[PDB]
Amino acid sequence: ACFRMTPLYNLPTHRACNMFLESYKAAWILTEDHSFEDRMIDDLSKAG
């Protein structure tokens, strides 16, 4: 099978977009926002 797999340039446009989003879970899952953690308990709770 692996020898008969299809090139990328024959895929329909609609299908070649869903694979992009599912595969592009490589810029959110690794990026870190931090932010809400130390500023959370600071503005909330304390000084409330």
Binding site: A1, C2, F3, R4, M5, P12
Partner: protein
């Protein structure tokens, strides 16, 4: 499975089936399925259409038709995919391939196969054509 067929030919089959829909419910009988199936190009004998009802009453629906069409195209697709997938392996495409060339190209098909596996694979067998590779891997 029913995942070996692209969407366009599924659409073509749906159009062919709907064009001769009985009353919109998709219930058709044995005589008419041969007519609708010979309408879009494929014209085989009467034996296969005799066994189709045997695999699945006089009540034929679209899912059963799609499944039987799918698995009568899939065997041909699988039997033919073993010849086109080899075209990239040889430069000219005829079948002759040097044994030295595969030492650095047959380890990078994306299967994460390192040198040891291909050592054992090619050692267990000059230039080798495609049919010997068929016997080599299909076993």
């Amino acid at each position: 499975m029913a995942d070996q067929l692209t969407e366009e030919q599924i659409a073509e089959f749906k159009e062919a089936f709907s064009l001769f829909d009985k009353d919109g419910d998709g219930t058709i009988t044995t005589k008419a399925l041969g007519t609708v199936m010979r309408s879009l190009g494929q014209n085989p004998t009467e034996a296969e259409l005799q066994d189709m009802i045997n695999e699945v009453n006089g009540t034929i629906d679209f899912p059963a038709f799609l499944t039987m069409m799918a698995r009568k195209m899939k065997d041909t697709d699988s039997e033919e995919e073993i010849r086109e997938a080899f075209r990239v392996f040889d430069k000219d495409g005829n079948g002759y391939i040097s044994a030295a060339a595969l030492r650095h190209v047959m380890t990078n098909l994306g299967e994460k196969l390192t040198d040891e596996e291909v050592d054992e694979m090619i050692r267990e067998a000059g230039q080798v054509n495609y049919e010997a590779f068929v016997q080599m891997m299909t076993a």
